[PDB]
Amino acid sequence: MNTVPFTSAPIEVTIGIDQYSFNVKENQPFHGIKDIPIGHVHVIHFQHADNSSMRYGYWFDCRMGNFYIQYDPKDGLYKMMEERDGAKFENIVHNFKERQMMVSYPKIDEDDTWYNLTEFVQMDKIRKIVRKDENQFSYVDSSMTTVQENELSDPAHSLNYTVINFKSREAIRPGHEMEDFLDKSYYLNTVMLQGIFKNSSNYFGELQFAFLNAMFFGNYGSSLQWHAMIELICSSATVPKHMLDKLDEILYYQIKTLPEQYSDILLNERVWNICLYSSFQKNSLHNTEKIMENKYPELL
């Protein structure tokens, strides 16, 4: 189990850790989060009480360093930092645990939700989407735009997701215009899987990461990316059977976890209806279709 120490909590903030969250009052004696499960990426995120504009947060993996949060009163946000002095970190953490100033990562034993949402997500790939290589953790917020959004403006602060565009020369082989546009298998299997992602795990990892940035930060370009990666699979007549089964599990847990009250903004009616009811894979996502129909039948 690992720990993220918080210097202090000078401003009132709602703090999220993965799918959990709690309210910290201005100058309440909050000094961090303990018992964080090793073996997964995690995200610690923030919404100030005074300005619900800008949710923001940090993707991290506790195996890659000792990390802590400290409010910066000049830049006005809770910043993640790395402490390199490991003795000084264990010491601080131990003092705050002894004084019981930390909340415990509240995972129920039966519960594999976070695993299921992050199964293919790897800190190395996150750091390539979010470029800032002097840190081992990655900052994301509500307002960051994607490389593709910037093609349609600060490149350093962008989400470098894999560009997917169904009406592009990359997607469409000369002489197979109709075939490749109506059945995207070439684009999925040869261009994207064999060419760019190398395997389906890296593909699913980016898909899962885009969903999570969409959900936790309301990052609109991440939502676009998540839906595009779903649609590319659903619009392909030829998909490995193992990918279809895994996709159904991935989407199931995403739909399960989504706040009911956010379904109106984070779920694209056209893509979901197409994917569940018109696409080649309309019959291949049994779990996802069942949960969608029972939880958001309005959308369909």
Binding site: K167, S168, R169, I172, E177, M178, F181
Partner: protein, 237 residues
């Protein structure tokens, strides 16, 4: 964006553009089989690609052989149209290629955009106008070349004959749309109007009769009466 009432005059400026109409590409007769089921028989079609400024009609004849062994022919027909239009643009010198292609039906947008990916600078546009280009097969000489074709074939007609020697392209296009609208509403009556006077002939190299200015005004008036008429006969007014 879309072409409509408000930006009608753009059609007659000096930026090359083409209208593409796919409504006569896939054509069938529907008939009963010996068993009493229904089947279709394809007949020759055409793509109607028109430069509204000059009257250039690039008439691509679609021979029934292109459908042989194919499924989902109404969807294929849109992609075949897009394939032939793209081929036409590629065949043209750069300085004759259109800057915009306006499709008369929205279902052509994606097929044509995909086929024209190589031409990112050609704008593919829909239109809110209900243009009567489906009636092009009521022009006798166009129908005749389509039905006689035994292979795929491109034919070139000025659909305005020599009208631009005397009138503007705006006026020429209005006349054409009026004639086609009339032929679409009541072909027999429209054709009666155009041909009732044996002394006014169609030149071998023309599609329409050689009316004087004064006779065209009369023709045009008769075509508007017809269209208004049929509209009563249809709606009981």
């Amino acid at each position: 964006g879309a072409m409509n009432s408000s930006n009608y005059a753009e059609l007659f400026n000096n930026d090359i553009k083409l209208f593409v109409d796919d409504t006569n590409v896939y054509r069938v007769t529907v008939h009963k089989t010996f068993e009493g089921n229904v089947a279709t028989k394809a007949i020759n079609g055409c793509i109607f690609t028109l430069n509204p400024k000059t009257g250039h009609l690039f008439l691509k004849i679609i021979h029934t052989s292109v459908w042989a062994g194919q499924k989902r022919l109404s969807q294929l027909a849109k992609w075949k149209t897009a394939e032939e239009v793209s081929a036409l643009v590629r065949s043209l010198p750069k300085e004759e290629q259109p800057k915009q292609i306006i499709v008369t039906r929205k279902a052509m947008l994606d097929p044509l955009e995909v086929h024209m990916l190589d031409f990112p600078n050609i704008a593919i546009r829909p239109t809110e106008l209900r243009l009567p280009f489906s009636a092009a097969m009521s022009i006798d000489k166009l129908s005749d070349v389509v039905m006689k074709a035994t292979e795929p074939q491109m034919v070139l007609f000025n659909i305005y004959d020599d009208w631009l020697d005397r009138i503007s392209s705006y006026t020429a296009f209005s006349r054409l749309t009026l004639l086609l609208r009339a032929l679409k509403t009541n072909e027999e009556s429209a054709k009666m109007i155009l041909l009732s006077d044996p002394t006014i002939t169609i030149k071998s190299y023309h599609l329409w009769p050689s009316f004087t200015d004064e006779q065209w005004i009369t023709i045009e008036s008769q075509m508007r009466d017809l269209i208004l008429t049929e509209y009563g006969r249809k709606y009981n007014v």
